[PDB]
């Protein structure tokens, strides 16, 4: 009966942040207390929500947005926010209902001379709508000047690798992020309790 | 999952040519757009070229009208043809599968081991 959280959180590999995973969770029982005061997790901010009251309260769906950023960017996995991530990788909506977990993952997701495999969208033509994902491999027009599709002056390839080394300072270390988002639109309850 | 692997590098005379070969394997729910990158060792890991699913190339201005990117999906093999090599184009060269989708499975991308290209006077 019990919910498959251990596969989101205790996962082998995680999403680059432009390319952000999700599972929807349904038709199962959710003890969230083994998240809040798990306290293995660094950051833990609930919006719309007392983090007691959810642990016996009910939803149509829980959706669980697994991905990986720099520590200094964790500020942006939050409503009303601004800059590279909330603009170009993953937004949240301004009246978000849900929780935001991260934890420092330098021990895992850094390597000797830099893990390239987590990644982020620099520039984009406009800002993302709430829970937009983008995977564009398509050159950015910085200038008025045309691209010829040649990467070059004012003509930039819009994704980058972060390149996490363990010798980094704490803000430029990788944090693993989950975003539990809660809904109840109108057909039936599927996730509570006990 | 994908294991990518590069091949067909090494030392050569300036002005000559080389063909780099990115062999794939056990694949995913997607055809990934694919790219080449190099490490001008010192300068960071830097963009060389792309071919998409839709088949459009783009190249970095450095190698324009000198290098060429192509795939033979039969072999599941990706080609960088490099003509008119200078010593600047020494580096470890890497192939890069990108992100692509298919309805919830979300292939992140992968890099390969690389192959050292080397050029002289």
CSV table of C-alpha atoms in Angstrom, one decimal:
chain,number,residue,atom,x,y,z
A,1,UNK,CA,0.0,0.0,0.0
A,2,UNK,CA,2.8,2.4,1.1
A,3,UNK,CA,4.1,5.2,-1.3
A,4,UNK,CA,7.4,4.9,-3.4
A,5,UNK,CA,9.2,7.9,-2.1
A,6,UNK,CA,12.5,6.0,-1.5
A,7,UNK,CA,12.8,5.7,-5.3
A,8,UNK,CA,12.5,9.6,-5.8
A,9,UNK,CA,14.8,10.6,-3.0
A,10,UNK,CA,17.3,7.6,-2.4
A,11,UNK,CA,17.8,7.6,-6.3
A,12,UNK,CA,21.1,6.6,-8.1
A,13,UNK,CA,21.2,9.5,-10.6
A,14,UNK,CA,19.1,12.8,-10.7
A,15,UNK,CA,17.9,15.2,-13.3
A,16,UNK,CA,19.8,18.1,-14.8
A,17,UNK,CA,17.7,21.1,-13.9
A,18,UNK,CA,16.4,22.3,-17.4
A,19,UNK,CA,15.6,18.6,-18.0
A,20,UNK,CA,13.7,18.1,-14.8
A,21,UNK,CA,12.1,14.8,-13.8
A,22,UNK,CA,8.8,14.3,-12.3
A,23,UNK,CA,6.8,11.3,-11.0
A,24,UNK,CA,3.1,11.8,-10.3
A,25,UNK,CA,2.3,9.8,-7.1
A,26,UNK,CA,-1.2,8.2,-6.7
A,27,UNK,CA,-3.3,5.5,-5.0
A,28,UNK,CA,-1.0,5.1,-2.0
A,29,UNK,CA,-0.3,6.1,1.7
A,30,UNK,CA,2.2,8.9,2.4
A,31,UNK,CA,4.1,9.2,5.8
A,32,UNK,CA,5.8,12.5,5.1
A,33,UNK,CA,7.2,12.8,8.7
A,34,UNK,CA,10.2,10.7,7.6
A,35,UNK,CA,11.0,13.7,5.3
A,36,UNK,CA,10.4,16.8,7.5
A,37,UNK,CA,12.4,15.8,10.6
A,38,UNK,CA,14.4,13.3,8.6
A,39,UNK,CA,16.9,16.1,8.8
A,40,UNK,CA,19.3,14.4,6.5
A,41,UNK,CA,17.7,17.1,4.2
A,42,UNK,CA,19.2,20.6,4.4
A,43,UNK,CA,16.4,23.0,3.2
A,44,UNK,CA,12.6,22.4,3.7
A,45,UNK,CA,10.1,25.2,3.0
A,46,UNK,CA,6.3,24.5,2.9
A,47,UNK,CA,4.1,27.1,1.2
A,48,UNK,CA,0.2,26.9,1.5
A,49,UNK,CA,1.0,24.2,4.1
A,50,UNK,CA,1.6,23.5,7.8
A,51,UNK,CA,4.1,20.5,7.6
A,52,UNK,CA,2.2,18.6,10.4
A,53,UNK,CA,-1.2,18.8,8.9
A,54,UNK,CA,-0.5,17.2,5.5
A,55,UNK,CA,0.5,14.0,7.3
A,56,UNK,CA,-3.2,13.2,7.7
A,57,UNK,CA,-4.6,15.2,4.7
A,58,UNK,CA,-5.7,14.1,1.3
A,59,UNK,CA,-5.1,14.9,-2.4
A,60,UNK,CA,-6.0,14.0,-6.0
A,61,UNK,CA,-2.3,13.9,-6.8
A,62,UNK,CA,1.2,14.5,-5.4
A,63,UNK,CA,3.9,15.4,-8.1
A,64,UNK,CA,7.6,15.1,-7.3
A,65,UNK,CA,10.0,17.2,-9.4
A,66,UNK,CA,13.5,15.5,-9.0
A,67,UNK,CA,16.5,17.7,-10.1
A,68,UNK,CA,20.0,19.2,-9.4
A,69,UNK,CA,21.4,22.8,-9.1
A,70,UNK,CA,24.1,24.8,-7.3
A,71,UNK,CA,23.4,25.6,-3.6
A,72,UNK,CA,23.3,29.3,-4.2
A,73,UNK,CA,20.4,28.7,-6.7
A,74,UNK,CA,18.2,27.0,-4.0
A,75,UNK,CA,16.7,30.4,-3.3
A,76,UNK,CA,15.1,30.2,-6.8
A,77,UNK,CA,13.0,27.0,-6.1
A,78,UNK,CA,10.5,29.2,-4.5
A,79,UNK,CA,7.5,31.4,-5.5
A,80,UNK,CA,8.0,35.0,-6.8
A,81,UNK,CA,11.7,34.3,-7.6
A,82,UNK,CA,14.0,35.6,-10.2
A,83,UNK,CA,17.2,34.8,-12.2
A,84,UNK,CA,18.6,31.8,-14.3
A,85,UNK,CA,16.6,28.9,-12.8
A,86,UNK,CA,13.1,30.3,-12.0
A,87,UNK,CA,13.3,32.1,-15.4
A,88,UNK,CA,14.9,29.4,-17.7
A,89,UNK,CA,14.9,25.9,-16.1
A,90,UNK,CA,12.1,25.4,-13.6
A,91,UNK,CA,9.6,28.0,-12.4
A,92,UNK,CA,7.2,27.7,-9.5
A,93,UNK,CA,3.7,29.4,-9.6
A,94,UNK,CA,3.2,32.4,-7.4
A,95,UNK,CA,0.4,30.8,-5.2
A,96,UNK,CA,2.2,27.4,-5.0
A,97,UNK,CA,0.9,24.8,-2.6
A,98,UNK,CA,3.6,22.3,-1.6
A,99,UNK,CA,7.0,21.6,-0.1
A,100,UNK,CA,10.6,22.2,-1.3
A,101,UNK,CA,13.3,19.8,-0.2
A,102,UNK,CA,17.0,20.0,-1.0
A,103,UNK,CA,20.2,18.5,0.4
A,104,UNK,CA,23.9,18.9,-0.3
A,105,UNK,CA,25.1,16.2,-2.7
A,106,UNK,CA,28.8,17.0,-3.1
A,107,UNK,CA,29.8,13.6,-1.7
A,108,UNK,CA,27.7,12.1,-4.6
A,109,UNK,CA,27.4,14.4,-7.7
A,110,UNK,CA,30.9,15.9,-7.8
A,111,UNK,CA,33.9,14.1,-9.3
A,112,UNK,CA,37.7,14.7,-9.5
A,113,UNK,CA,38.0,17.3,-12.3
A,114,UNK,CA,34.2,17.9,-12.7
A,115,UNK,CA,31.0,15.9,-13.3
A,116,UNK,CA,29.6,17.4,-16.6
A,117,UNK,CA,26.4,15.4,-16.5
A,118,UNK,CA,24.2,17.9,-14.5
A,119,UNK,CA,23.3,20.9,-16.6
A,120,UNK,CA,21.4,24.2,-17.0
A,121,UNK,CA,19.8,26.6,-19.4
A,122,UNK,CA,21.6,29.9,-19.6
A,123,UNK,CA,19.6,32.4,-21.9
A,124,UNK,CA,16.2,31.8,-23.5
A,125,UNK,CA,13.9,33.8,-25.7
A,126,UNK,CA,11.4,34.5,-22.8
A,127,UNK,CA,10.8,33.3,-19.3
A,128,UNK,CA,9.2,29.9,-18.5
A,129,UNK,CA,5.6,29.6,-17.5
A,130,UNK,CA,5.0,27.7,-14.1
A,131,UNK,CA,6.2,24.0,-14.5
A,132,UNK,CA,7.4,24.6,-18.1
A,133,UNK,CA,10.3,22.3,-19.1
A,134,UNK,CA,12.6,23.2,-22.0
A,135,UNK,CA,15.0,20.9,-23.9
A,136,UNK,CA,15.9,23.2,-27.0
A,137,UNK,CA,19.3,22.5,-28.5
A,138,UNK,CA,18.8,25.6,-30.6
A,139,UNK,CA,21.2,28.6,-30.8
A,140,UNK,CA,20.3,31.8,-28.9
A,141,UNK,CA,20.2,35.1,-30.8
A,142,UNK,CA,21.9,37.6,-28.3
A,143,UNK,CA,22.5,40.3,-30.9
A,144,UNK,CA,20.3,41.9,-33.5
A,145,UNK,CA,23.1,40.2,-35.6
A,146,UNK,CA,22.0,36.9,-37.4
A,147,UNK,CA,23.5,33.5,-36.4
A,148,UNK,CA,24.1,31.6,-39.7
A,149,UNK,CA,23.6,28.8,-37.1
A,150,UNK,CA,27.3,29.4,-36.2
A,151,UNK,CA,28.1,29.6,-32.4
A,152,UNK,CA,30.2,32.7,-32.1
A,153,UNK,CA,29.9,36.5,-31.4
A,154,UNK,CA,26.4,37.2,-29.9
A,155,UNK,CA,25.3,33.6,-30.9
A,156,UNK,CA,25.4,31.2,-28.0
A,157,UNK,CA,24.6,27.5,-27.4
A,158,UNK,CA,22.0,27.9,-24.6
A,159,UNK,CA,22.8,24.9,-22.3
A,160,UNK,CA,25.8,24.5,-20.0
A,161,UNK,CA,27.4,21.9,-17.7
A,162,UNK,CA,28.0,23.0,-14.1
A,163,UNK,CA,31.1,20.7,-13.8
A,164,UNK,CA,30.9,20.0,-10.0
A,165,UNK,CA,34.4,19.4,-8.5
A,166,UNK,CA,34.6,18.4,-4.7
A,167,UNK,CA,37.1,21.2,-4.1
A,168,UNK,CA,34.3,23.8,-4.9
A,169,UNK,CA,32.9,26.2,-2.2
A,170,UNK,CA,29.5,25.5,-0.6
A,171,UNK,CA,27.3,27.7,-2.9
A,172,UNK,CA,29.0,26.2,-6.1
A,173,UNK,CA,28.4,22.7,-4.6
A,174,UNK,CA,25.5,20.6,-6.1
A,175,UNK,CA,22.2,20.4,-4.2
A,176,UNK,CA,19.6,17.7,-5.0
A,177,UNK,CA,16.1,19.1,-5.1
A,178,UNK,CA,12.6,17.6,-4.8
A,179,UNK,CA,9.4,19.7,-5.1
A,180,UNK,CA,6.3,18.0,-3.7
A,181,UNK,CA,3.4,19.8,-5.4
A,182,UNK,CA,-0.2,19.2,-4.1
A,183,UNK,CA,-3.5,19.4,-6.0
A,184,UNK,CA,-7.1,18.4,-5.6
A,185,UNK,CA,-9.0,19.1,-8.8
A,186,UNK,CA,-12.2,17.7,-8.8
A,187,UNK,CA,-12.3,13.8,-9.3
A,188,UNK,CA,-11.4,11.7,-6.4
A,189,UNK,CA,-9.0,11.6,-3.5
A,190,UNK,CA,-6.0,9.2,-3.8
A,191,UNK,CA,-3.1,10.1,-1.4
A,192,UNK,CA,-3.2,10.6,2.5
A,193,UNK,CA,-2.6,9.5,5.9
A,194,UNK,CA,-3.0,7.6,8.2
B,1,UNK,CA,21.0,3.6,-20.4
B,2,UNK,CA,23.6,4.4,-23.3
B,3,UNK,CA,27.2,3.8,-23.3
B,4,UNK,CA,28.7,6.2,-25.8
B,5,UNK,CA,32.4,5.6,-26.9
B,6,UNK,CA,34.7,7.8,-29.1
B,7,UNK,CA,37.3,6.4,-31.5
B,8,UNK,CA,39.9,7.2,-34.3
B,9,UNK,CA,42.1,10.0,-32.8
B,10,UNK,CA,45.9,10.5,-32.3
B,11,UNK,CA,48.9,12.5,-33.5
B,12,UNK,CA,49.0,13.8,-37.1
B,13,UNK,CA,50.8,16.4,-39.4
B,14,UNK,CA,49.2,19.9,-39.6
B,15,UNK,CA,47.1,20.4,-42.8
B,16,UNK,CA,46.0,16.7,-42.7
B,17,UNK,CA,42.6,15.1,-41.9
B,18,UNK,CA,40.9,12.9,-39.3
B,19,UNK,CA,37.5,11.1,-38.9
B,20,UNK,CA,36.2,10.7,-35.3
B,21,UNK,CA,33.7,7.9,-34.7
B,22,UNK,CA,31.2,8.0,-31.8
B,23,UNK,CA,29.8,4.4,-31.4
B,24,UNK,CA,26.6,4.2,-29.2
B,25,UNK,CA,24.8,1.3,-27.4
B,26,UNK,CA,21.8,0.1,-25.6
B,27,UNK,CA,19.5,2.8,-26.3
B,28,UNK,CA,16.4,4.7,-25.1
B,29,UNK,CA,12.9,5.9,-25.9
B,30,UNK,CA,14.2,8.7,-28.1
B,31,UNK,CA,16.5,9.7,-30.9
B,32,UNK,CA,18.7,12.2,-29.0
B,33,UNK,CA,20.2,15.2,-30.8
B,34,UNK,CA,24.0,14.7,-30.6
B,35,UNK,CA,27.1,17.0,-30.4
B,36,UNK,CA,30.9,17.2,-30.4
B,37,UNK,CA,33.0,19.1,-27.8
B,38,UNK,CA,36.7,19.5,-27.1
B,39,UNK,CA,39.1,20.4,-24.2
B,40,UNK,CA,41.9,22.8,-25.4
B,41,UNK,CA,43.7,21.4,-22.5
B,42,UNK,CA,43.7,24.4,-20.1
B,43,UNK,CA,40.7,26.2,-21.8
B,44,UNK,CA,37.4,24.6,-20.3
B,45,UNK,CA,35.3,21.9,-22.1
B,46,UNK,CA,33.9,23.8,-25.2
B,47,UNK,CA,31.2,23.5,-27.9
B,48,UNK,CA,32.4,22.2,-31.3
B,49,UNK,CA,29.2,21.2,-33.3
B,50,UNK,CA,25.7,19.6,-33.2
B,51,UNK,CA,23.4,17.5,-35.4
B,52,UNK,CA,19.7,17.4,-34.2
B,53,UNK,CA,17.0,14.8,-34.8
B,54,UNK,CA,15.6,17.3,-37.3
B,55,UNK,CA,19.1,17.0,-39.1
B,56,UNK,CA,20.1,20.7,-38.9
B,57,UNK,CA,23.7,21.2,-38.0
B,58,UNK,CA,25.2,24.1,-36.2
B,59,UNK,CA,29.0,24.5,-35.8
B,60,UNK,CA,31.1,26.8,-33.6
B,61,UNK,CA,32.7,29.7,-35.6
B,62,UNK,CA,36.2,28.2,-34.9
B,63,UNK,CA,35.9,25.3,-37.2
B,64,UNK,CA,33.4,26.6,-39.8
B,65,UNK,CA,34.1,25.4,-43.3
B,66,UNK,CA,36.7,23.0,-42.2
B,67,UNK,CA,34.9,20.4,-40.0
B,68,UNK,CA,31.7,18.4,-40.8
B,69,UNK,CA,29.2,16.4,-38.6
B,70,UNK,CA,27.2,13.4,-39.8
B,71,UNK,CA,25.4,10.2,-38.6
B,72,UNK,CA,24.7,6.7,-40.1
B,73,UNK,CA,21.8,5.5,-37.9
B,74,UNK,CA,22.4,2.1,-39.5
B,75,UNK,CA,25.7,1.8,-37.6
B,76,UNK,CA,24.3,4.0,-34.7
B,77,UNK,CA,27.6,5.8,-35.3
B,78,UNK,CA,28.4,9.6,-35.5
B,79,UNK,CA,31.1,11.2,-37.5
B,80,UNK,CA,33.3,14.3,-37.1
B,81,UNK,CA,35.3,14.8,-40.3
B,82,UNK,CA,38.1,17.3,-39.6
B,83,UNK,CA,39.9,18.9,-42.6
B,84,UNK,CA,42.8,21.5,-42.6
B,85,UNK,CA,43.9,20.7,-39.0
B,86,UNK,CA,46.0,23.4,-37.2
B,87,UNK,CA,47.7,22.8,-33.8
B,88,UNK,CA,44.8,24.9,-32.1
B,89,UNK,CA,42.6,21.9,-32.8
B,90,UNK,CA,44.7,19.7,-30.5
B,91,UNK,CA,42.5,18.7,-27.5
B,92,UNK,CA,40.6,15.7,-26.0
B,93,UNK,CA,37.4,15.5,-28.2
B,94,UNK,CA,34.1,14.3,-26.6
B,95,UNK,CA,30.7,13.2,-28.1
B,96,UNK,CA,27.5,14.3,-26.3
B,97,UNK,CA,24.0,12.8,-26.4
B,98,UNK,CA,21.5,15.5,-25.4
B,99,UNK,CA,18.3,15.6,-23.6
B,100,UNK,CA,15.3,14.4,-25.4
B,101,UNK,CA,11.8,13.1,-24.3
B,102,UNK,CA,9.0,10.6,-24.7
B,103,UNK,CA,6.0,11.3,-22.4
B,104,UNK,CA,7.6,10.8,-19.0
B,105,UNK,CA,10.9,9.0,-19.5
B,106,UNK,CA,13.4,11.8,-20.0
B,107,UNK,CA,16.9,10.9,-21.2
B,108,UNK,CA,19.3,13.4,-19.6
B,109,UNK,CA,22.2,13.0,-21.9
B,110,UNK,CA,25.6,11.3,-21.6
B,111,UNK,CA,29.2,12.0,-22.5
B,112,UNK,CA,31.9,9.6,-23.7
B,113,UNK,CA,35.5,8.8,-22.6
B,114,UNK,CA,37.0,11.0,-25.4
B,115,UNK,CA,39.9,10.7,-27.9
B,116,UNK,CA,43.1,12.8,-28.0
B,117,UNK,CA,43.7,14.7,-31.3
B,118,UNK,CA,47.2,16.1,-31.6
B,119,UNK,CA,48.7,18.4,-34.4
B,120,UNK,CA,52.3,20.0,-35.0
B,121,UNK,CA,55.1,22.0,-36.7
